[PDB]
Design a protein around this ligand. Structure first.
Ligand SMILES: O=C(NNS(=O)(=O)c1ccccc1F)c1ccccc1
Ligand SMILES: [Zn+2]
Length: 269
């Protein structure tokens, strides 16, 4: 009845949530997706015919980041409507709270790919409203299950703040976050803040300006690190250089990151 398994690239992936693909696409045992243009198909035969014909080998839009074989494409929902709609229906298989699939024009989509000789292979993405009334620098963020917990979510989170910095603005992901989303942002925030308190008298407003993390996300992060005191109605940073290093040395920050190299980012607001 609902779509419950997809084939994309060389992966078969079980669905986590309902996504409103048309009814007759549900009925099939599997839905088959072109990993490059994200067209969804009902049959292994139409899929293999499509694979032989389709000329795309990367996302549409502008490649705004390239370092070695990690690429980000910026895709405007108005310019590439069908691709963005396909991406949103794919995303909704793995996001409980996403509600927007068809009215994609207000959004820009940042698609993360990993490149080999065959083409640029989609790992995940984040959407962003062109005009956010609430200052959200991410709408939805999704990493395909076989790539989760492997560094790519940290990359996209970092990337979303590097855009916010180029915008001279603070930003926060739209709520609610998934369970993994919550843990991932808290861990990203903790690292960035701890490294700034090592590398540098920084105030909370100072840190917000340096990182584009909102003051509230800074404060909730420092509270979970027990690194803020409260005085006459104001949160104030309170931490020893040694306690910062204790946190940074811990086993949580020990996996080598895919880092966003701002030299390789090509973008203006
Ligand atoms: O895959 C995910 N997180 N684990 S991670 O990338 O190794 C990671 C490691 C350290 C800090 C933040 C991270 F994100 C993820 C999936 C969906 C939304 C957001 C993140
Ligand atoms: Zn295709």
């Amino acid at each position: 009845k609902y779509v419950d398994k997809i084939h994309i690239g060389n992966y078969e992936i079980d669905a986590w949530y309902f996504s409103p693909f048309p009814e007759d696409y549900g009925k099939q045992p599997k839905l088959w997706l072109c990993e490059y243009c994200l067209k969804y198909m009902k049959y292994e035969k139409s899929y293999r015919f499509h694979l032989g014909q389709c000329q795309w080998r990367q996302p549409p839009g502008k490649e705004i980041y390239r370092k070695s074989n990690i690429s980000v494409h910026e895709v405007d929902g108005k310019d590439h409507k069908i691709y963005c709609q396909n991406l949103c229906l794919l995303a909704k298989l793995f996001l409980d709270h996403k509600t927007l699939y068809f009215d994609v024009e207000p959004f820009v989509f940042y698609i993360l790919t990993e490149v080999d000789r065959q083409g640029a292979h989609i790992v995940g993405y984040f959407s962003k409203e062109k005009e956010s009334p609430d200052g959200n620098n991410v709408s939805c963020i999704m990493i395909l299950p076989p790539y989760q917990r492997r560094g790519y979510g940290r990359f996209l989170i970092a990337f979303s703040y590097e855009l916010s910095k180029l915008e001279s603005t603070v930003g926060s992901p739209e709520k609610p976050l998934s369970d993994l989303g919550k843990l991932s942002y808290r861990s990203y925030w903790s690292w960035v803040l701890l490294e700034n308190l090592r590398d540098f008298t920084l105030s909370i407003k100072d840190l917000s300006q340096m990182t584009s993390i909102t003051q509230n996300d800074i404060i909730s992060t420092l509270q979970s690190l027990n690194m803020v005191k409260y005085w006459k109605g104001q949160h104030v940073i309170c931490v020893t250089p040694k306690l910062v290093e204790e946190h940074l040395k811990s086993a949580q920050y020990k996996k080598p990151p895919i880092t966003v190299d701002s030299v390789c980012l090509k973008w203006a607001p």
